[PDB]
Design a protein around this motif. Structure first.
Motif, mmCIF file in Angstrom:
data_model
loop_
_atom_site.group_PDB
_atom_site.id
_atom_site.type_symbol
_atom_site.label_atom_id
_atom_site.label_comp_id
_atom_site.label_asym_id
_atom_site.label_seq_id
_atom_site.Cartn_x
_atom_site.Cartn_y
_atom_site.Cartn_z
ATOM 1 N N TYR A 15 0.887 -1.143 0.000
ATOM 2 C CA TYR A 15 0.000 0.000 0.000
ATOM 3 C C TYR A 15 0.935 1.205 0.000
ATOM 4 O O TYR A 15 0.672 2.212 -0.655
ATOM 5 N N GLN A 19 -0.292 1.002 -2.688
ATOM 6 C CA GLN A 19 -1.174 -0.100 -2.229
ATOM 7 C C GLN A 19 -1.140 -1.482 -2.912
ATOM 8 O O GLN A 19 -1.267 -1.586 -4.131
ATOM 9 N N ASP A 22 -5.280 -5.484 -5.772
ATOM 10 C CA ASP A 22 -6.362 -6.340 -5.315
ATOM 11 C C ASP A 22 -6.329 -7.605 -6.145
ATOM 12 O O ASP A 22 -7.144 -7.828 -7.038
ATOM 13 N N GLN A 28 -2.135 -10.575 -0.528
ATOM 14 C CA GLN A 28 -3.070 -9.875 0.344
ATOM 15 C C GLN A 28 -2.997 -10.374 1.783
ATOM 16 O O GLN A 28 -3.028 -9.581 2.736
ATOM 17 N N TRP A 29 -2.897 -11.688 1.948
ATOM 18 C CA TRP A 29 -2.811 -12.237 3.299
ATOM 19 C C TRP A 29 -1.545 -11.728 3.983
ATOM 20 O O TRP A 29 -1.534 -11.404 5.176
ATOM 21 N N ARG A 31 -0.001 -8.997 3.336
ATOM 22 C CA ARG A 31 -0.167 -7.591 3.629
ATOM 23 C C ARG A 31 -0.874 -7.474 4.959
ATOM 24 O O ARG A 31 -0.501 -6.662 5.798
ATOM 25 N N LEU A 32 -1.891 -8.299 5.163
ATOM 26 C CA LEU A 32 -2.598 -8.245 6.434
ATOM 27 C C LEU A 32 -1.705 -8.611 7.626
ATOM 28 O O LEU A 32 -1.724 -7.929 8.645
ATOM 29 N N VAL A 33 -0.923 -9.679 7.500
ATOM 30 C CA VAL A 33 -0.034 -10.096 8.594
ATOM 31 C C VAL A 33 1.093 -9.104 8.904
ATOM 32 O O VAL A 33 1.445 -8.855 10.054
#
Lengths: 71, 146
Positions: A15, A19, A22, A28-29, A31-33
């Motif tokens: 991001y 960012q 998508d 994405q996972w 990025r979340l962790v």
């Protein structure tokens, strides 16, 4: 996987550069962790990670940086 | 003033009209450029400042540093944000502040600032870059040019 993520952060921003796209997934996972008490676990390095944080923000203010892994 | 400069640049580009990788005409042009480092440097710095400033303005962190009900970075206020991105000549910073037009209390619309003078710069700047690039491509070395 950890090595790939580290390489990505040092020379690019998810991001942060512009960012994470998508797309899977996975990316994405990750990025979340991304924010963890310990991220450079099993790999070898760490302070380098802190240094990477330091390079940017650094046009990013200390706050966005703390907000990420922060600490 | 900007138009005349562009015309001069065009004439200069035109004079070489191509040549040997190392060529007498090229050497002469390189020599003139070498003779003038300070003037050229000043022009380049000015262009970078105009572009750099615009970039900074575009940036979210910059917008964030000085929140306002209706615009402006306040005199202080814009200075601090610029300081924060931490990339400028201090004299240059003061100069930028001066270029910015105060409106009864260190308030700057700014977007207007980027737009002017960005459009004119975009038009001229390109010609200059092109000439510089061509010159660099044609004769390396000499390094001074590099």
């Amino acid at each position: 996987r950890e090595k790939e993520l580290a390489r990505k952060l040092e020379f690019d921003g998810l991001y942060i550069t512009e960012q994470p796209g998508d797309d899977d997934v996975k990316g994405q996972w990750d990025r979340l962790v991304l924010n963890t008490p310990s991220f450079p676990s099993n790999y070898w390095d760490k302070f380098v990670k802190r240094k990477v944080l330091d390079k940017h923000g650094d046009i990013f203010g200390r706050e966005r940086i703390a907000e990420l892994l922060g600490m | 003033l900007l138009d005349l400069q562009k015309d001069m640049v065009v004439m200069l580009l035109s004079l070489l009209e191509g040549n040997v990788v190392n060529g007498m005409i090229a050497r002469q042009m390189v020599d003139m450029l070498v003779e003038s480092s300070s003037n050229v440097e000043m022009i380049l710095k000015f262009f970078d400042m105009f572009l750099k400033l615009k970039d900074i303005v575009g940036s979210e962190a910059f917008q964030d540093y000085v929140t306002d009900p209706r615009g402006l970075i306040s005199k202080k206020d814009f200075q601090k944000a610029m300081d924060s991105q931490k990339q400028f000549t201090g004299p240059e910073i003061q100069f930028l502040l001066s270029c910015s037009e105060a409106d009864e209390n260190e308030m700057i619309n700014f977007e207007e600032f980027a737009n002017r003078f960005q459009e004119p710069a975009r038009d001229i700047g390109f010609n200059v870059a092109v000439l510089l690039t061509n010159l660099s491509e044609h004769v390396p070395h000499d390094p001074r040019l590099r």
